[PDB]
Amino acid sequence: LLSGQADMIVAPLTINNERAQYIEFSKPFKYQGLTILVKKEIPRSTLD
Amino acid sequence: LVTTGELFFRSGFGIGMRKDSPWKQNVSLSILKSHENGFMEDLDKTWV
């Protein structure tokens, strides 16, 4: 964007301090947060 | 696999722009207008 070869950055962008300091955003179009992912489960004990 | 946990720091998304370009005001207004027509919810339920 900043050099000479872009005008809109339609992409998974995200608001923060420095990027909003150096360019002007618009109103947000999604309110996603930051979260964590792990793997699912399986059956269990009692054996014999 | 599955996602767990809560949401820490929660920014938003957004279409970026240049600094002082003629579009910014109108593009922000268009995003805000479309966000109150179910359009964002419509596309979210269509794809995500």
Added chain:
Amino acid sequence: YYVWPRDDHLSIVTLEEAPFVIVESVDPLSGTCMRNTVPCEKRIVTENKTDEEPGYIKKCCKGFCIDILKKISKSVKFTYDLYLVTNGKHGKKINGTWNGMIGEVVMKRAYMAVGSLTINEERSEVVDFSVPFIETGISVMVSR
């Protein structure tokens, strides 16, 4: 009570509702607002017969938005003196005029609207907002 009539000194038109901002009466003590709050300035025009002076019955304010406003005011070194609402809840185009807090801001003398506001395609053409600082929306309420 001219508030010491004496370029960073601006009015702040606020409102009290929810755990966002709550207004309490002055701490009795000796007639002064307690600590951990900022002195608000309630305005009363309850005189329904004569054009009496507005009621300058001061009070105290505390909550979410006032705390964030204090943090911001410290952050950029500007002085402030809060001031409550006189008529209307928030503001609405009532036959081509804003009757409320946004009307107070657009009609000068306010220069801020910190409170419980909603960003919409209805006031961006008269005032202009900042980045939202809480996720609002429309949801439901059903008993479990």
